[PDB]
Write a protein that binds this ligand. Structure first.
Ligand SMILES: O=C(O)[C@@H](O)[C@@H](O)[C@H](O)[C@H](O)CO
Ligand SMILES: [Cl-]
Ligand SMILES: [Mn+2]
Length: 395
């Protein structure tokens, strides 16, 4: 009702129109200039061109998601100094156009990851899924990483061998593309060969080293962001665990605390993605919002469901997964109200994040799972929760 409701739109080529977005009830668009090569500067011209298309629909461009961080920055090799300079200028250009929140990630090599893009739920709709056994089969029988066996239980290894033996040639190709070619929003894509040689750049890069590389980026970017009035909102790792022998360093509350200890400026903040942090049971989403609320500048309000094997998860309906959506929304609303009580008034934009593929969308070739109807449904569910919390606790 008063909640700042936003919606990820990929641009003119997105099958979801800006009319669909408005009818969904979003007043704000989340988007990026996806066509601009990784690490190059986003010109004012390109920015204003996207901004105008959105304003034309009677919407506003609320959040950027994402400005990509070149791999040379994450490995701290090659042209990193130039890429950082460009990233800085992108932020200058963005703020000059009046776009003041930037979402970004530090997932190395791979972005957000799923093994199955078309998992049929009992109601007949389709969800994204991360099957631990599918993923083990990829790592040990397709990628053949040495020695990936250390990331798995004996039983999972036996199961991975069995699943692989039932896979068709095309099952194996699809699994591979699913994992490495890039899902919607990802700024990197690989063939198996490209992927395998890219992993080698990380043979001497452990958790501590990646943190060091991230620190170089933050200390360079945050002062520019602060100077220019832009707030940075880091998106967590998805899944928030180390995969493929590579570290993942935006997964837990310790990692969030590390980021604040590294750069104190308020320009250094967070995207509270409940779908991603919520994958692992040990993340206390509500505590995360209580502790880091002042720095939460963007939320993704979706939910996942862990299965019998707790590393296997699929995307749930927004109110029926592992995320206690009531408690999460309550904490966000309480954060917005303390801002208001400290004198300001500074809402936290939300987007429904992912949706199931359902109704008309089942007959379409869709961006997984950025189809419209499922995302509309999640948006509406969360709208309702938030409105009732406003009336029950803040009327
Ligand atoms: O939670 C997620 O995985 C999503 O929000 C992503 O689709 C999005 O691209 C994020 O910015 C991570 O790259
Ligand atoms: Cl969205
Ligand atoms: Mn998210």
């Amino acid at each position: 009702s008063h909640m700042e409701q936003t919606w990820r739109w990929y641009g003119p080529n997105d099958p979801v129109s800006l009319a669909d977005v408005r009818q969904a009830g979003a007043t704000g668009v989340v988007t990026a200039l996806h066509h601009i090569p990784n690490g190059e500067v986003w010109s004012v011209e390109e920015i204003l061109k996207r901004k105008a298309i959105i304003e034309d629909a009677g919407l506003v461009w609320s959040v950027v998601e994402s400005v990509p961080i070149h791999e040379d920055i994450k490995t701290h090799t090659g042209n990193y100094e130039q890429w950082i300079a460009n990233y800085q200028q992108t932020l200058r250009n963005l703020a000059q156009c009046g776009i003041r929140t930037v979402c970004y990630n530090f997932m190395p090599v791979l972005d957000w990851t799923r093994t199955d893009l078309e998992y049929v739920l009992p109601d007949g709709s389709k969800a994204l899924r991360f099957d631990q056994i599918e993923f083990a089969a990829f790592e040990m029988h397709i990628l053949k990483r040495p020695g990936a066996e250390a990331d798995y239980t004996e039983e999972e290894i036996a199961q991975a061998a069995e699943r692989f033996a039932t896979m068709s040639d095309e099952d194996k190709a699809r699994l591979t593309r699913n994992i490495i070619a890039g899902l919607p929003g990802a700024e990197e894509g690989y063939t198996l060969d490209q992927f395998r040689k890219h992993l080698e750049l990380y043979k001497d890069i452990d958790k501590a080293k990646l943190r060091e590389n991230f620190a170089v980026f933050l200390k360079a970017i945050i002062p520019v962001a602060e100077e220019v009035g832009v707030r940075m909102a880091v998106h967590p790792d998805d899944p928030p665990r180390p995969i493929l022998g590579l570290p993942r360093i935006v997964s837990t509350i310790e990692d969030m605390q590390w980021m604040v200890d590294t750069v104190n400026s308020m320009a250094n903040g967070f995207t509270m993605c409940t779908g991603s942090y919520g994958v692992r049971a040990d993340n206390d989403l509500v505590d995360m919002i209580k502790q880091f609320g002042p720095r939460i500048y963007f939320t993704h309000l979706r939910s996942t469901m862990r299965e019998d094997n707790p590393k296997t998860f699929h995307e749930a309906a927004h109110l029926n997964g592992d995320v206690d959506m009531y408690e999460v929304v309550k904490a966000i609303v309480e954060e917005e109200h303390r801002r208001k009580a400290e004198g300001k008034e500074d809402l936290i934009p939300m987007r429904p994040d992912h949706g199931h593929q359902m109704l008309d969308d089942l007959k379409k070739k869709t961006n997984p799972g950025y189809s419209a109807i499922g995302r509309l449904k999640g948006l509406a569910e969360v709208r309702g929760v938030e409105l009732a919390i406003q009336r029950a606790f803040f009327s």
